[PDB]
Amino acid sequence: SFPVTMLPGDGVGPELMHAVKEVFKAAAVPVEFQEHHLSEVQNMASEEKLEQVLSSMKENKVAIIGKIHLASYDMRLRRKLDLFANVVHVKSLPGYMTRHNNLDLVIIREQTEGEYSSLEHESARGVIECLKIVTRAKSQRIAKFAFDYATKKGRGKVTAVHKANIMKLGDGLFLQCCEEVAELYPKIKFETMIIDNCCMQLVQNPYQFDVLVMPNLYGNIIDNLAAGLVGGAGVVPGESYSAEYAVFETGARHPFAQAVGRNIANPTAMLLSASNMLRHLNLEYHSSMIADAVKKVIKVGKVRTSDMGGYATCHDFTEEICRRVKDLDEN
Amino acid sequence: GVQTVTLIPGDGIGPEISAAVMKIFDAAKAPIQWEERNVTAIQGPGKWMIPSEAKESMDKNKMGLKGPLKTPIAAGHPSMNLLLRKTFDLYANVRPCVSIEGYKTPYTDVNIVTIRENTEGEYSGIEHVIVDGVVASIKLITEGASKRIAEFAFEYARNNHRSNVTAVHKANIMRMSDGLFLQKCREVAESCKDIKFNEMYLDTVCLNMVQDPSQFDVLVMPNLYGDILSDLCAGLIGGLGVTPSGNIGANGVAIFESVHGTAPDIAGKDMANPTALLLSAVMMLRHMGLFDHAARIEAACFATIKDGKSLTKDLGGNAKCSDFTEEICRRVKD
Ligand SMILES: NC(=O)c1ccc[n+]([C@@H]2O[C@H](COP(=O)([O-])OP(=O)(O)OC[C@H]3O[C@@H](n4cnc5c(N)ncnc54)[C@H](O)[C@@H]3O)[C@@H](O)[C@H]2O)c1
Ligand SMILES: NC(=O)c1ccc[n+]([C@@H]2O[C@H](COP(=O)([O-])OP(=O)(O)OC[C@H]3O[C@@H](n4cnc5c(N)ncnc54)[C@H](O)[C@@H]3O)[C@@H](O)[C@H]2O)c1
Ligand SMILES: [Ca+2]
């Protein structure tokens, strides 16, 4: 019934998407995936595949995607779809024990400027400049998003992470636009932390954080730091947004190319954001069901992939959920 | 013989922690004389500079011990830490991260050395307002600096019998600059096959470091990455109150400092942890070949920590910084 754009992506991307399709079938989820292949496609054919994804999104409004790769294909995609805001929900899984259990964090990263625009040159032989872009426009949007997230989801603190002491013009602009819109949301507590400090805080005591907003590169750092705290990739989901579109990804994006054709990859992250997707499509029964089937299979601990201390293969772990899921629908 | 070290006490909590380490040095009867000057003042001559008296003390003594200097957020004067490192070509920042025996954290037997290029990277002072509302900060990576820090880290690994060096980079995202950093480490790696070499993207390092620190040894990065990863791993072993550092240049010129900044929220009180600046003065003694004073000063603070009884606030304690320091000095002397 519901058309969803699908870009399987790199490495385990396709094997992950496959587990989503299998779990959906078992749950009888009324979604029909329109698959599109964008990863490492020839450079001359790039912009046409880029456009039909743009136009596929114009029909479907929603997508689920793997990892991708004169700017990078990822940036072009983010730009054509204007996916300015990235959110990654760092949440402990009740049976899956780490050094930071009971953790509930949200990381909001803007992902259309900064170090990611490929603006480099050689100014002398051996001397290379690399330009990191910060704009009022984009930093304004992402701070409003963070504060709308905090309001929409009943959160209470939004912390802006910067390095404005030494990059006073660039990170300064980002930081004061967050200061500006932080007054438009007086019911939300606003704080600020220099980024190195905050990564120290994230390891030593991440329970004081709630919601975090930052530019692109720091979001990459902290997306991955925080995912590590609750059991790593394989487990943490993320989604990214425009004004129209919602696209669902894994939280700490990595291709896991060493795992391709082995049966070892964890579909927990992709299955979870698939359930996050189904909520965005107003399929709350299907999303709630798939999600806490995944959480129960993990909690009982009979079947677990190798990154979660078990020995089960990807397929065995995927079939374990489908059996659980297909049974829930009966009971 | 007695040797003179330049002492920059610094802003915020820096004056109290220096006093501490000085006091522990007199207790240990170290052959050290302190020449105190204040880099805290930043002076505009276009150029920004270190006050003349600090510059001469360093150029005379060429050993420094320094507390944190405050750098305004988004507003005032540039990092005078950056300025110190560039005017003395302190190109290598050495940030070992080692688990403290008597203090339990969720991670055990952490032995990390972050080696961070100190002069360039995203910590150049270079930004430009392109148009209204459009800012461009400029990162700089050069052949010569990248080759030199890579040689340093392979050489450090030999001096301290470490077996692997990891080039940490983001050359997928920043292909030219990190590419040049990584290609230059590959070159020095190929000239020192006695040392096992590998490279890892920065996100992956942080994704793994917090899960299994067992897997890393010596780390080399350009400036901005090393700044962040060294705070990340301070989280592992006890926090910013125990983590030492040293800014190394050519010809045995060096300024030792802790990894932490000013700590403006605990400044006036007596809550600070001095082991960070202490352990870096311990690095400083060993740099100077004063091994047997370094051994005792170290042994005392560790013994003081493995006991309990007097640990400062940040390490699960009630003890004032003064009270904490006195137990280290008490333990030295015996
Ligand atoms: N193929 C080559 O010749 C070559 C050369 C240079 C670089 N690279 C790239 O470097 C990459 C490796 O670097 P990286 O930093 O991106 O590491 P990565 O892709 O392997 O991911 C980092 C770690 O995150 C974990 N992880 C990610 N997805 C997971 C999942 N579904 N389930 C369980 N665990 C998961 C894994 O532990 C993984 O090792 C390669 O995958 C490759 O694309 C490749
Ligand atoms: N010169 C340097 O080496 C250096 C390093 C970092 C920051 N700074 C500067 O100082 C200021 C620091 O800002 P920040 O908040 O990120 O600094 P910070 O490193 O002090 O981080 C703040 C918190 O870290 C903890 N902490 C740090 N040192 C501690 C200690 N000795 N004992 C107990 N707790 C400690 C406390 O939570 C402290 O309040 C900035 O102006 C910044 O420019 C200087
Ligand atoms: Ca730091």
Author numbering:
A (entry chain B): 14 to 82, 91 to 352
B (entry chain A): 3 to 47, 49 to 337
The authors write:
Crystals of αMICT+Ca+NADβNAD belong to space group C2221 and there are two αMβ heterodimers in an asymmetry unit, which form an (αMβ)2 heterotetramer through a noncrystallographic 2-fold axis. In this structure, there are an ICT, NAD, and Ca2+ bound at the active site of the α subunit, which are clearly defined in the electron density map; in addition, there is an NAD bound at the pseudo-allosteric site of the β subunit, and the ADP-ribose moiety of NAD is well defined in the electron density map albeit the nicotinamide moiety is poor defined. In the αMICT+Ca+NADβNAD structure, the active site is bound with the substrate ICT, the cofactor NAD, and a Ca2+ ion. This is the first pseudo-Michaelis complex reported for HsIDH3 and other NAD-IDHs. In contrast, compared to that in the αMβ structure, the α large domain in the αMICT+Ca+NADβNAD structure exhibits a 6° rotation toward the α-β interface owing to the binding of ICT and NAD, resulting in a “closed” conformation of the active site (see Discussion later). The binding of NAD to the active site induces the α large domain and in particular, the β3A-α3A and β12A-α8A loops to rotate toward the α-β interface, resulting in a closed conformation of the active site. In contrast, in the αMICT+Ca+NADβNAD structure, the N-terminal regions of the α7 helices adopt the active helical conformations and the sidechain of Tyr126A also adopts the active conformation, which lead the sidechains of Asp230A, Asp234A, and Asp217B in proper orientations to form coordination bonds with the Ca2+ ion. In addition, the sidechain of Asp230A is in close proximity to the hydroxyl group of Tyr126A (2.8 Å) and the ε-ammonium group of Lys184B (2.9 Å). Thus, the Lys184B-Asp230A-Tyr126A triad appears to be in favorable geometries for proton transfer. Specifically, the α-carboxyl group interacts with Arg88A, Arg98A, and Arg119A; the β-carboxyl group interacts with Arg88A and Arg119A; the γ-carboxyl group interacts with Thr74A, Ser82A, Asn84A; and the α-hydroxyl group forms hydrogen bonds with Lys184B, Asp217B, and Asp230A, and a coordination bond with the Ca2+ ion.
